[PDB]
Amino acid sequence: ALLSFERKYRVRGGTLIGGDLFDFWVGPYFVGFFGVSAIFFIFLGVSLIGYAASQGPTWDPFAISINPPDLKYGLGAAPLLEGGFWQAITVCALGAFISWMLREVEISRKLGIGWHVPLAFCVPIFMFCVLQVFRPLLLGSWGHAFPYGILSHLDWVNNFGYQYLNWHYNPGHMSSVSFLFVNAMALGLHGGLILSVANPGDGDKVKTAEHENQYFRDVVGYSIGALSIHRLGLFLASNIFLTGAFGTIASGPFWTRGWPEWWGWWLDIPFWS
C-alpha cells in the first residue's frame, strides 16, 4: 500500500481549498478537491464521447472521430450531433487538465518542493488553448479546431498545413521543430551520461561528477553542469510549443498567403533583387 520510505511524508496540509474534507489518498493516488474535479470532468467527457461514438457509423478505435461544427455556426452553440458533442467535450477536457494541473500544486505544497511540474504542465495546456480556442476565436468559428480522432486529427493537421502550401517554410514551425529534435537529442545525452557514470561495466568502479564534466569537455569542448542541464531541458522542452504557438496563431489571422512567400521580405530587398 505504501513505499518503504512513504509513511513519513503522508501528512495533512498543502490543500489550496477544501481543508480536511478532500485532503486524503485513495490507493497510491492523492485526491484533494482538484482530484475530484478532475474525476468529474474526466467522467463527464468520457461518457459524452461514448454517447457520440455510438451514434457514429463505426466502433473501430482508429477510425472514430467526433468533429466540430461547420463554419456557418460561428462561435455559437452547434447541434449536439452536428458538432455540439465536440464543444461539450472541449469544456470537459480543459476542466480536467486545469484540475489535473492545480492538483499537482497541492501535491507540491505538501512535499515542500517547487511548483515546477504543474507550472511546466501549463505549457501543454496553453498549446491546447492555442488550437481549440484562441485561433478559432481569431478566425471567427469553432469549426477551425481539430477533430478528436486517433487517425483523424492527423487529417486535420495535414489539411491545416497544406492550406498554406508548405508549412515547413513557416518560421514559427521551423523554431518549434528544432526544439523537438534538440530536446529529443538532449535527453539521450543526459540519460546516457547519467547511465554511463553509474553503470561503467565489468567490475569497474562507479565514477564521479568530475567524470561527467570531463566527458563533455573532451568530446564537445564544454560541459553545462548537473543542475543546469535540467534547467536546459525544461527550457528546450517548453519552447517546442512556446515558439510553435506563434507559428500556428499567425496562420490565418495574421497571414493568409503561403508560408514560403513570407520569406520574400528577405528575398525581395531592392539592393540585391
Partner: protein, 323 residues
C-alpha cells in the same frame, strides 16, 4: 520560491579540474576561460577540448563534404557573392533527377552529391568513434555511443540504405536548407501520406514523449534542488529525501513512479526509439509498402468522412476525355 532554479545567484571560482583518462591526456588542447554570464545559467568554464585521431578525422572528412556542397551551391548562382548570401536557403546540391538505377551517376547530375555524402558518412563515423572512445577512456559506459549510433543509422537509412533497397539514388535527401525540407513533401506524396505510416506514428509519439519526459524530469530535478536533487549519481547509490519527494510527487499524481536511475532509462529509451521507429518506417517504405494510406484503407484503419461538396468522378475515366 527558489531563485537558484531560475539562475545561479553567486558564482564560485577555483582551479581547473582534470579527470585523467587511460590515454590521450596529452591530447587535451587549449587554455580554459570563464564567461561570467554563461556562469549564471550554466557552468562558467569553457574548454579545453580533446583532439585525438578520430576527432581530426571527423573534421577532415566533415569539412571536405561541406566544401563539396558549398562549391556546388556557388555554382548554382554563377558565383555571385551577394546572390549567395541572399538566396542561400534556396540553394542546394541535389541527387540525380534522371533514373540511373544504382549505377554511379554523372558529376553534373548527382555525382557530387553521392561524393558529398560519403565524406559526410565517414565524418559521422569518425565522431562516433570519439563518442565511444572518450567514454571507455574515462571508465564510462557506452550508453551515449549506442544511442548516437541509432541516430547515425537513421541518416544511413534515409541517406543511402533506402535508395539502395529500391535501387535509385534519386530517392536520397538533397543538401541545403529549403531543399532537404522540400524532400519531405516529395517523399511523403510519392508514398501516400506519411500520416498513414504506423512507424511515423511511433516516431512522433516518442519524440512527443521526449518533450514531456524532459519537461517533467527537468521540472522534478529543479523542484527538488533545495535537497541537492541535482546530485543524481549519489542519489542513486544512497537515496536522499530529494528522490523520495520526487517519486512520491508522481506516485500520488499518476499512481506509479520510477527511481532516480530508471527515469534516465526511460528517457534514453524514448530518445532511442524515435530513431529506431523512424528507421523501421523507412526500411518498410518502397520495399514492402508503396502507398501508406491505401495500406491503411486495405487494413481498415484509415478514417472516412462524408461529402461536403458532391462526389467528384476521376475525369480520366469519362468516355472521350483526353489522356
Amino acid at each position: 520560491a527558489d531563485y537558484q532554479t531560475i539562475y545561479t545567484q553567486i558564482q564560485a571560482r577555483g582551479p581547473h579540474i582534470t579527470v585523467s583518462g587511460e590515454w590521450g591526456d596529452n591530447d587535451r588542447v587549449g587554455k580554459p576561460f570563464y564567461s561570467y554570464w554563461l556562469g549564471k545559467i550554466g557552468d562558467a568554464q569553457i574548454g579545453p577540448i580533446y583532439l585525438g585521431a578520430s576527432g581530426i578525422a571527423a573534421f577532415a572528412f566533415g569539412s571536405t563534404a561541406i566544401l563539396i556542397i558549398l562549391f556546388n551551391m556557388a555554382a548554382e548562382v554563377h558565383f555571385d557573392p551577394l546572390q549567395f548570401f541572399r538566396q542561400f536557403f534556396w540553394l542546394g546540391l541535389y541527387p540525380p533527377k534522371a533514373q540511373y538505377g544504382m549505377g554511379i551517376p554523372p558529376l553534373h547530375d548527382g555525382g557530387w552529391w553521392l561524393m558529398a555524402g560519403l565524406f559526410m558518412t565517414l565524418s559521422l563515423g569518425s565522431w562516433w568513434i570519439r563518442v565511444y572512445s572518450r567514454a571507455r577512456a574515462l571508465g564510462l559506459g557506452t550508453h551515449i555511443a549506442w544511442n548516437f549510433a541509432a541516430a547515425i543509422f537513421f541518416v544511413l537509412c534515409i541517406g543511402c540504405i533506402h535508395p539502395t533497397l529500391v535501387g535509385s539514388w534519386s530517392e536520397g535527401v538533397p543538401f541545403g536548407i529549403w531543399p532537404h525540407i522540400d524532400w519531405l513533401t516529395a517523399f511523403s506524396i510519392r508514398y501516400g501520406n506519411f500520416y498513414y505510416c504506423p512507424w511515423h506514428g511511433f516516431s512522433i509519439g516518442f519524440a512527443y514523449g521526449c518533450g514531456l519526459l524532459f519537461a517533467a524530469h527537468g521540472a522534478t530535478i529543479l523542484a527538488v534542488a533545495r535537497f541537492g536533487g541535482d546530485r543524481e549519481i549519489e542519489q542513486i547509490t544512497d537515496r536522499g529525501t530529494a528522490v523520495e519527494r520526487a517519486a512520491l510527487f508522481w506516485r500520488w499524481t499518476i499512481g506509479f513512479n520510477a527511481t532516480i536511475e530508471s527515469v534516465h532509462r526511460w528517457g534514453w529509451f524514448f530518445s532511442l526509439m524515435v530513431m529506431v521507429s523512424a528507421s523501421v518506417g523507412i526500411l518498410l517504405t518502397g520495399t514492402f509498402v508503396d502507398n501508406w494510406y491505401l495500406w491503411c484503407v486495405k487494413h481498415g484503419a484509415a478514417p472516412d468522412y462524408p461529402a461536403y461538396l458532391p462526389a467528384t468522378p476521376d475525369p480520366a475515366s469519362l468516355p472521350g476525355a483526353p489522356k
